[PDB]
Amino acid sequence: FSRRRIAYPFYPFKKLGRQHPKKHDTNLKTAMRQFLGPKNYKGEYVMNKYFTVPTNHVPNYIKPDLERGQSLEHPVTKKPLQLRYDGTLGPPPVENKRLQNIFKDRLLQPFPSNPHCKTNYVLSPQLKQSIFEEITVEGLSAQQVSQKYGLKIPRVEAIVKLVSVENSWNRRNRVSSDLKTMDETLYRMFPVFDSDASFKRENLSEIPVPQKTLASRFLTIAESEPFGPVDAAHVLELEPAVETLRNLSTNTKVIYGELVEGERSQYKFTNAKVGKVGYRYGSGNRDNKKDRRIGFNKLGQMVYI
Amino acid sequence: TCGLVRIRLARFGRKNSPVYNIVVANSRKARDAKPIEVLGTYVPVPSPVTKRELKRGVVPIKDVKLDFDRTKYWIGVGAQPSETVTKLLRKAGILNDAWATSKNSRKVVFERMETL
Amino acid sequence: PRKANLLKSLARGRVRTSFNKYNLFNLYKKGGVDLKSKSLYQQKWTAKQETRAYHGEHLTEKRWQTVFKPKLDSVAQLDIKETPFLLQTFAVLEKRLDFALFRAMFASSVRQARQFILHGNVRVNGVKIKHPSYTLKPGDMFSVKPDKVLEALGAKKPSFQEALKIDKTQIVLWNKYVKEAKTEDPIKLSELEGDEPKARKLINLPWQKNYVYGRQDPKKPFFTPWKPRPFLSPFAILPHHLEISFKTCHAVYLRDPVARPGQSEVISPFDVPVHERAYMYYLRNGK
Amino acid sequence: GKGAAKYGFKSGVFPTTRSILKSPTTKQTDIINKVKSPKPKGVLGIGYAKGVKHPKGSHRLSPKVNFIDVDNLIAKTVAEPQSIKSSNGSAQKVRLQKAELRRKFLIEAFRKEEARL
Amino acid sequence: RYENRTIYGDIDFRYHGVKLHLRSAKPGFGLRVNHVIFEICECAGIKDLSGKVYKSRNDMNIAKGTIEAFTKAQKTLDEVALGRGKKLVDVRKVYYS
Amino acid sequence: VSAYIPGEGHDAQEHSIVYVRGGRCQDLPGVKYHVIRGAGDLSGVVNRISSRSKYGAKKPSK
Amino acid sequence: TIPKPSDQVPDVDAFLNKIGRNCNELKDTFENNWNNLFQWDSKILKEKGVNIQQRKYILKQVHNYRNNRPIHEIKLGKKSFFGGERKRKAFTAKWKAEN
RNA sequence: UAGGUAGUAGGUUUAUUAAGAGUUAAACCUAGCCAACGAUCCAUAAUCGAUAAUGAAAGUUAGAACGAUCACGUUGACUCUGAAAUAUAGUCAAUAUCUAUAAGAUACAGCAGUGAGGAAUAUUGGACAAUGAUCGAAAGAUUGAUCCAGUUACUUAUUAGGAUGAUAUAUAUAUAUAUAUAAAUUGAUUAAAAAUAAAAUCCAUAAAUAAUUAAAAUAAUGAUAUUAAUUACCAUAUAUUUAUAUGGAUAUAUAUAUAUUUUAAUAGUCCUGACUAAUAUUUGUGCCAGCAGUCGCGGUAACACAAAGAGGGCG
Ligand SMILES: [Mg+2]
Ligand SMILES: [Mg+2]
Ligand SMILES: [Mg+2]
Ligand SMILES: [Mg+2]
Ligand SMILES: [Mg+2]
Ligand SMILES: [Mg+2]
Ligand SMILES: [Mg+2]
Ligand SMILES: [Mg+2]
Ligand SMILES: [Mg+2]
Ligand SMILES: [Mg+2]
Ligand SMILES: [Mg+2]
Ligand SMILES: [Mg+2]
Ligand SMILES: [Mg+2]
Ligand SMILES: [Mg+2]
Ligand SMILES: [Mg+2]
Ligand SMILES: [Mg+2]
Ligand SMILES: [Mg+2]
Ligand SMILES: [Mg+2]
Ligand SMILES: [Mg+2]
Ligand SMILES: [Mg+2]
Ligand SMILES: [Mg+2]
Ligand SMILES: [Mg+2]
Numbered sequence A: 001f002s003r004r005r006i007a008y009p010f011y012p013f014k015k016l017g018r019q020h021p022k023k024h025d026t027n028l029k030t031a032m033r034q035f036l037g038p039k040n041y042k043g044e045y046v047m048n049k050y051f052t053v054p055t056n057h058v059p060n061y062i063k064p065d066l067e068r069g070q071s072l073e074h075p076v077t078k079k080p081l082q083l084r085y086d087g088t089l090g091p092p093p094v095e096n097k098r099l100q101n102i103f104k105d106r107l108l109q110p111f112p113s114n115p116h117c118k119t120n121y122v123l124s125p126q127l128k129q130s131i132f133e134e135i136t137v138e139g140l141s142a143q144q145v146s147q148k149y150g151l152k153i154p155r156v157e158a159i160v161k162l163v164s165v166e167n168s169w170n171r172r173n174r175v176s177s178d179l180k181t182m183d184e185t186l187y188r189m190f191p192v193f194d195s196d197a198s199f200k201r202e203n204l205s206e207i208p209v210p211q212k213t214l215a216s217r218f219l220t221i222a223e224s225e226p227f228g229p230v231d232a233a234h235v236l237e238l239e240p241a242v243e244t245l246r247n248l249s250t251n252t253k254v255i256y257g258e259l260v261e262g263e264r265s266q267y268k269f270t271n272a273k274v275g276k277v278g279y280r281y282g283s284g285n286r287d288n289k290k291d292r293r294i295g296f297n298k299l300g301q302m303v304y305i
Numbered sequence B: 001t002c003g004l005v006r007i008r009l010a011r012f013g014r015k016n017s018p019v020y021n022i023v024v025a026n027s028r029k030a031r032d033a034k035p036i037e038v039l040g041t042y043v044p045v046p047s048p049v050t051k052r053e054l055k056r057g058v059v060p061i062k063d064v065k066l067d068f069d070r071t072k073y074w075i076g077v078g079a080q081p082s083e084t085v086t087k088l089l090r091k092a093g094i095l096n097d098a099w100a101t102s103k104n105s106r107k108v109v110f111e112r113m114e115t116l
Numbered sequence C: 001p002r003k004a005n006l007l008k009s010l011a012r013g014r015v016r017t018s019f020n021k022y023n024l025f026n027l028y029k030k031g032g033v034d035l036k037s038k039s040l041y042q043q044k045w046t047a048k049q050e051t052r053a054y055h056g057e058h059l060t061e062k063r064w065q066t067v068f069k070p071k072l073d074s075v076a077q078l079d080i081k082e083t084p085f086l087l088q089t090f091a092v093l094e095k096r097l098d099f100a101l102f103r104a105m106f107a108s109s110v111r112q113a114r115q116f117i118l119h120g121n122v123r124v125n126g127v128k129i130k131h132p133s134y135t136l137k138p139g140d141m142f143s144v145k146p147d148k149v150l151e152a153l154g155a156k157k158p159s160f161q162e163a164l165k166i167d168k169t170q171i172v173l174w175n176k177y178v179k180e181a182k183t184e185d186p187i188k189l190s191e192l193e194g195d196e197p198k199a200r201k202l203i204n205l206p207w208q209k210n211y212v213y214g215r216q217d218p219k220k221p222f223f224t225p226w227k228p229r230p231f232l233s234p235f236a237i238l239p240h241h242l243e244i245s246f247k248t249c250h251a252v253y254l255r256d257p258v259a260r261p262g263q264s265e266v267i268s269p270f271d272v273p274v275h276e277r278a279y280m281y282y283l284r285n286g287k
Numbered sequence D: 001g002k003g004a005a006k007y008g009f010k011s012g013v014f015p016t017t018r019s020i021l022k023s024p025t026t027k028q029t030d031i032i033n034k035v036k037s038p039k040p041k042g043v044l045g046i047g048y049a050k051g052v053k054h055p056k057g058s059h060r061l062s063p064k065v066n067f068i069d070v071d072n073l074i075a076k077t078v079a080e081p082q083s084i085k086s087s088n089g090s091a092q093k094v095r096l097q098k099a100e101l102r103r104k105f106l107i108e109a110f111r112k113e114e115a116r117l
Numbered sequence E: 001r002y003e004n005r006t007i008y009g010d011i012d013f014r015y016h017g018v019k020l021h022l023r024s025a026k027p028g029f030g031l032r033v034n035h036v037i038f039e040i041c042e043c044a045g046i047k048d049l050s051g052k053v054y055k056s057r058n059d060m061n062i063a064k065g066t067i068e069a070f071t072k073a074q075k076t077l078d079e080v081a082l083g084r085g086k087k088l089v090d091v092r093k094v095y096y097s
Numbered sequence F: 001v002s003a004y005i006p007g008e009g010h011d012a013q014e015h016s017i018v019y020v021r022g023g024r025c026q027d028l029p030g031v032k033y034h035v036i037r038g039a040g041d042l043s044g045v046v047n048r049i050s051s052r053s054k055y056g057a058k059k060p061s062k
Numbered sequence G: 001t002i003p004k005p006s007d008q009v010p011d012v013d014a015f016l017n018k019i020g021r022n023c024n025e026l027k028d029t030f031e032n033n034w035n036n037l038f039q040w041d042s043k044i045l046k047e048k049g050v051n052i053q054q055r056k057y058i059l060k061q062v063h064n065y066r067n068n069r070p071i072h073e074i075k076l077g078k079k080s081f082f083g084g085e086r087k088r089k090a091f092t093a094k095w096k097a098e099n
Numbered sequence H: 001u002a003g004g005u006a007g008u009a010g011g012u013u014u015a016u017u018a019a020g021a022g023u024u025a026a027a028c029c030u031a032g033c034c035a036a037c038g039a040u041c042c043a044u045a046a047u048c049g050a051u052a053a054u055g056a057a058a059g060u061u062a063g064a065a066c067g068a069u070c071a072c073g074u075u076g077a078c079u080c081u082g083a084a085a086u087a088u089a090g091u092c093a094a095u096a097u098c099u100a101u102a103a104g105a106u107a108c109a110g111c112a113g114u115g116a117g118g119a120a121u122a123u124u125g126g127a128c129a130a131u132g133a134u135c136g137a138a139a140g141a142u143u144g145a146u147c148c149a150g151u152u153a154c155u156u157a158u159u160a161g162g163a164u165g166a167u168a169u170a171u172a173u174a175u176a177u178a179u180a181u182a183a184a185u186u187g188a189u190u191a192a193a194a195a196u197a198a199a200a201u202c203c204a205u206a207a208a209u210a211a212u213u214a215a216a217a218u219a220a221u222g223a224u225a226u227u228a229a230u231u232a233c234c235a236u237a238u239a240u241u242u243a244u245a246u247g248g249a250u251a252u253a254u255a256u257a258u259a260u261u262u263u264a265a266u267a268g269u270c271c272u273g274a275c276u277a278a279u280a281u282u283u284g285u286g287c288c289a290g291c292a293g294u295c296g297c298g299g300u301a302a303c304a305c306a307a308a309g310a311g312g313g314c315g
């Protein structure tokens, strides 16, 4: 049994009772107003918890289940408030134990309804710089760096890439003041990556799961007969898991044509075996089907493959 | 051109965007019909260079993946190439100046070489 | 794509990919998605409603169905908690350029990000793209024009008249404060219609020296000394599959988002059952 | 599309790759040995049994396999010119060059094929 | 239930009219079964299941039949091992996926 | 063929050009067809607001 | 690169006359300027307002002149007095009947 | 359709053929051969894929499009040349039109196009620039193959605008600004909404307007073609796409101080009793009018007919 259910707040709020014929207000709108609190001459909803941006390295994610829908704090003191029988705000009579006692994991949980989604940590600029130095000047391998710090090798490579770009921008004097301020605000919002804290370090033994492993097999070996990971891999007809992890961590004749002064382009002739080279005859035209193949050019133009 | 067996370009791809299929075919059979042997491909639209690259002085390339040994064999048994195909072959370095007609016949900038 | 219409209504508590105030409120007051007292089909429908509202509202249904992959992805740690496999149903959309840009926080919304890249501001490995359906490979940089990023994450730049009105009230408040201090700089808005330099010359508070409330650099497309967006905190969710640098506004797409024993990297505001129901629906096209 | 999975998901077909040497060579010794070995009889037999006759007009055995002497083939298809130095005129020279090139290519092709097999 | 997510073997069980067929499933592959079966699995903690009902599809009898199949038609690997006097390894687990 | 004619008002004589489609009038036995109503001498059903394409009705155009 | 006017055709008009295919009545669209004719390309000719076939022919004859190949009015192909291969059998019979 | 078969089944020979064979022709023998695991006979149908559809798959369906194979070029037979033809050739006949009326000519299943049939399927287009094909020693000639554009939502795909946004006045290094008057649409008087929807505000981008320059093609030739693309007042000259400095373009105050084309936004259609997603309600009709894939709905309280409101799909 499903109806069309208008999405009112699960939490309790001051509903409409009666009101002046002309105003035409809705209960949802009223609930939204209450959530927001009073709006300034400027436009700012100051009394709302979630209006201002945190400067704490502690993300101010939402806890509607904990505070029971009452989002309004006093801006200077960050102390909670409610909507009383009069239109004026004031402090609550009973204090909330839910907001006072909160876990580590739930502070890094942006949405209340999904426990699995968590925020990734932000690297401190000094740490990034040190990583960049290690890879370039000291000349260490990326795997060693990853082990030291607790990042993944692709992540490390990405960081390195970004550092060099940042440096180039600084040289050119492109990093504006407004951009810097934004970067600082973003840094302040997110929690910092600690290289010593074991719970914060990224798990470096994550291999991706193939098809053959997922399909379950069972073997009736003798009660005493041993059967290790290697044996299992052999049965499945794969390389061992350790070897794949290690791998993850770590010709043809080409001619160029002569270029005369007048002609505008070269002719690159690559070799290719007959029975493997051409555009095949009687292939499936996929252009009028919805599984049609759309690629992209070297110049970022969209091209039908 | 003359012959029964002929090395020529069969057209493939879409409108306003041709790719070519270097084949050896019968003279009588159609242009885009199934041939004796496909030797290679040829996209006539050259690889587009970047503005910086253009400023530097780097020419575009026309990609021509091609079974060299097979093509040579076909030439040997006497399969006459078309006007465009023969030019392509000459450019590659299979065929000599001998095949160059009077219209084709200018200082060279870059010389040919095999690479890997 | 599918036209934007009533995306942030309250009577449908649909949680879109945006930083909008109405969207925030919808997120706040939804709680869970109720799947109790429903048939299997009804549950699947409600999942579809909620999950697709967040994940690709601009996409047409048929188009989405075509792109939708059954084969989800995961990683074995080989060293406990249960991996949430079926949170990966909308992993394929993060591969998109538009979604990746949104995750990076180079746009306020997915729609906005899409608009930005159509207008030719994003680049990916240098070359500029004008195609939201472009898909990142692992290792690909992407880079939005910094002004547009600032506009996305910054406040709305006020109109001149509005800014002047705001200034007037601030001035009055200041005057009231100095009077109160004494106990224990006026402007006429009707005259000063649209002379910005004149207004600047007139104004002199401690917290703004000349510039009107909303216009320190009128030529820039955002608020004054750049400050953040009005409700930026509850949506600033720093992703795993992107590496970001907010100084230059570059971002490396380092991974296709994947599910671990603890968590999924597909950032969604929905519990796993909802995502399972959605998957069930989209396997069979709602058969 | 369903039946393409037999052929490695290859939509469209190529024409069959055309053998450069169209019979087994003399240098392929193992094939020759196989051909010339005593043909079996009984259940899994090939020819006619010694005692049993064969139809009047028909041949008893199968025809013999013509093994290509590759050098001989080269000589026949691609003979070098006996009149070695008779060459004047531009067009004639061009023709001669073309001939030489064709000799080179077909020679190489055959020899390569022989080696390759 | 195997790995706290699916049944052990591919079971094929008859309860009165309904002929049940319930295949085991690789992890991530969801519940892909009759709506009654799905409902029962959600409550009983089965994440992964394939299967199909033949003959009668009487909702009540499905519900009764499927729980009977779960309790009765299933044998845990350990029980089988004990009965036969043999090791009964799960290859995927040994591999570490 | 015995064809049904849907809608409130029907303009059909003893010679009218009419197009037939394969529906079925369920209560009338032995009539397994519908005259499609926008086309032919059969005119579109008048003052139809809902479900206009199901009958002949054009869009009123304010 | 501009070439010199020869003794046989020293003028643009003379060149046009030589090449033929109704290349006359084209002395107004470009005046008798030798350099002008030779340097000009296809797009320019199109803008001026010449035909496609005429444009093609002129450029070819210019090219021939540059390479010093013999320019002359190689006329376009003509159907037989009787008819095209297909229509001949009937046409010929009709002609016979008339005569 | 239950018996069929008499060159039929087999043997021996001769002719014909490049060549086997009752394949034809001739001669002489033996009595066979096929068939209820479907013969003979009749009906229908061009065949197929590494093509298309659908399915978990085995399969099933299509045989438009791409490609491979066949057969035919109004109908039937025969002949000639030829390696190969019962040739879209020729001969004679058959059917139906043309004049020129003749031991005539034509047959659009080549491209356009017309009339008809039909529920239903396009321009009496442009170019040989490309890729092929035929003729030619070459020059270059021909090319309704072909390549291009035209019509047609038949199919697919990309775009088809984002961010902010619930009132209006009047009064008076801080900051929860606070009062007062006025107004406030369709519903409805509270979980009954329509509605962040509008309107406003900030910000672009398309198109336009100018300038420039590809690529398909080079020895030269570009139908497509107001070409794609790029720049926004143009150029050069440094660094590492951005930034600054020059050269000239320009115009008002009094050569050098601030500027630098312009600029938007617009969706249908089906549905809301259950199967089946759609709870904000109300009016009209009264087993009639009508609806209906299925079960059913309509007899004054119709969630099913006909509508308004609100809502749900797909787009
Ligand atoms: Mg010739
Ligand atoms: Mg209806
Ligand atoms: Mg309508
Ligand atoms: Mg016979
Ligand atoms: Mg006889
Ligand atoms: Mg005989
Ligand atoms: Mg039969
Ligand atoms: Mg037929
Ligand atoms: Mg078939
Ligand atoms: Mg076909
Ligand atoms: Mg068939
Ligand atoms: Mg056709
Ligand atoms: Mg025939
Ligand atoms: Mg015939
Ligand atoms: Mg026709
Ligand atoms: Mg005909
Ligand atoms: Mg008709
Ligand atoms: Mg059609
Ligand atoms: Mg041509
Ligand atoms: Mg033509
Ligand atoms: Mg479409
Ligand atoms: Mg009212």
Ligand SMILES: [Mg+2]
Pocket (backbone or CB within 6 Å): none
């Ligand atoms: Mg433009």
Ligand SMILES: [Mg+2]
Pocket (backbone or CB within 6 Å): A002, H277
């Ligand atoms: Mg329902």
Ligand SMILES: [Mg+2]
Pocket (backbone or CB within 6 Å): none
């Ligand atoms: Mg009523």
Ligand SMILES: [Mg+2]
Pocket (backbone or CB within 6 Å): H304
């Ligand atoms: Mg209904």
Ligand SMILES: [Mg+2]
Pocket (backbone or CB within 6 Å): none
């Ligand atoms: Mg109705």
Ligand SMILES: [Mg+2]
Pocket (backbone or CB within 6 Å): none
């Ligand atoms: Mg309505």
